[PDB]
């Protein structure tokens, strides 16, 4: 027998959050000609994902190619074509952990 030993009551404490610089988290510019090719490109693609694992996985998934490009801006453009655009915002915020810190959205 004991004395009052039951249900024992423990910490948890807390983390600390930390900002760098805001003004983009993830980068997305839509190009179409008014016909049906639809086109779509991304950037801010972490370290964890390469071009080979996100065109590997995108071609797999639903034949998504994810190639990359070399813009003026910076030289990083993640080509992506399909009719998924919803799908790769989807995907790649549920993939990058919940992020929408920002983003760069084009405008055409």
């Known amino acids: 027998m004991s004395i009052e030993n039951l249900k024992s009551f423990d910490p948890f404490a807390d983390t600390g959050d930390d900002e760098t610089a805001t003004s983009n988290y993830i980068h997305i510019r839509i190009q179409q000609r008014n016909g049906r090719k639809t086109l779509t490109t991304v950037q801010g693609v972490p ?62």
């Open 47 to 108: 370290e964890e994902y390469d071009l080979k694992r996100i065109l590997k996985v995108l071609k797999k998934d639903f034949a998504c190619n994810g190639n990359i490009v070399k813009d003026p801006e910076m030289g990083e453009i993640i080509q992506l074509q399909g009719d998924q655009r919803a799908k790769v915002c989807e995907f790649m915020i549920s993939q990058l952990g919940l992020q929408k810190k920002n983003i760069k959205i084009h405008g055409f």
